[PDB]
Design a protein around this ligand. Structure first.
Ligand code: GTP
Ligand code: GTP
Ligand code: MG
Ligand code: MG
Ligand code: MG
Ligand code: MG
Ligand code: MG
Ligand code: MG
Lengths: 133, 133
């Protein structure tokens, strides 16, 4: 079974927004981009819009699709789509994550993050308007 | 709920674009689509598209930029299509799988029998091809 996930890139003077995965639903303590599973019936955009609302409290406008990749966490097959999020109402707050943080993107290189992101960190940096090395 | 990730490519020839007529017995029969297919276990979208284009077109293709993602449910079976721009390949495509192959003016899509999943986003497609609507 494939699990299509959508997730977003939010931005603050070059910084980027990540959330600390909470301790009970686990890839615990790992830093990710906000987003989640697409529900039966919805489009990718609708799903991100919604996930961003329910996770950050923000009312977002979903921008360009930047990236897609696959990963296996065992038998569990996930497909992430990453979207640029230029525009929203309100400021985000930790409705789901342990912490929210605006970090320099460079810092991702030494932050505990999903192997699905770790494996494409270069592709990510590019999609953000930065070079890998 | 349940999902089938598909990868499909945009190949172009002096402005025209390449579609295949779905075979009569493996069916959404008679319908014109962009070549591609289902992603297998362990492969990246790119890997799957390179492979599909080989086994369907006979071409060794280089998979370029990701242009579109969309969802469609054909009743119970849930589909996620990623569309990639295919700029570079070795050889000329031949109908290894499809009933027929054709390079059409993209405008013609408006009056070709195409998957409802593509018809719903024809707007978004024209943009990804660099055209108007
Ligand atoms: N949100 C998010 N998920 C990621 C990322 N990288 C990999 N994933 C995986 O995508 C899957 C689905 O994301 P979730 O946030 O758990 O889905 P959700 O609907 O938002 O929340 P729950 O299903 O209740 O856990 C998880 O297994 C994540 O580990 C990422 O950068 N952001
Ligand atoms: N290839 C392709 N599939 C599309 C398109 N639009 C919707 N689809 C659906 O995507 C699904 C999978 O594509 P297929 O090409 O049939 O899968 P395949 O691996 O290439 O070949 P099969 O195993 O025989 O199905 C089908 O159910 C199509 O209905 C399109 O533009 N191109
Ligand atoms: Mg969620
Ligand atoms: Mg989430
Ligand atoms: Mg959810
Ligand atoms: Mg095929
Ligand atoms: Mg096919
Ligand atoms: Mg196939």
């Amino acid at each position: 079974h494939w699990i299509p996930v959508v997730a977003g890139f939010l931005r603050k003077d070059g910084k980027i927004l990540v959330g600390q995965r909470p301790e009970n639903n686990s890839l615990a303590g790992q830093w990710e981009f906000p987003g989640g599973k697409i529900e039966n019936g919805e489009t990718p955009e609708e799903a991100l819009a919604r996930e961003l609302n329910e996770e950050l409290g923000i009312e977002a406008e979903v921008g360009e699709l930047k990236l897609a990749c696959t990963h296996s966490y065992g038998d569990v097959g996930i497909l992430i789509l990453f979207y640029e999020i230029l525009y929203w109402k309100g400021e985000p707050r930790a409705k789901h994550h342990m912490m929210l943080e605006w970090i320099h993107p460079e810092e991702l290189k030494h932050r505990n993050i999903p192997e699905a992101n770790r494996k494409i960190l270069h592709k990510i940096y590019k999609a953000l308007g930065l070079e890998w090395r």
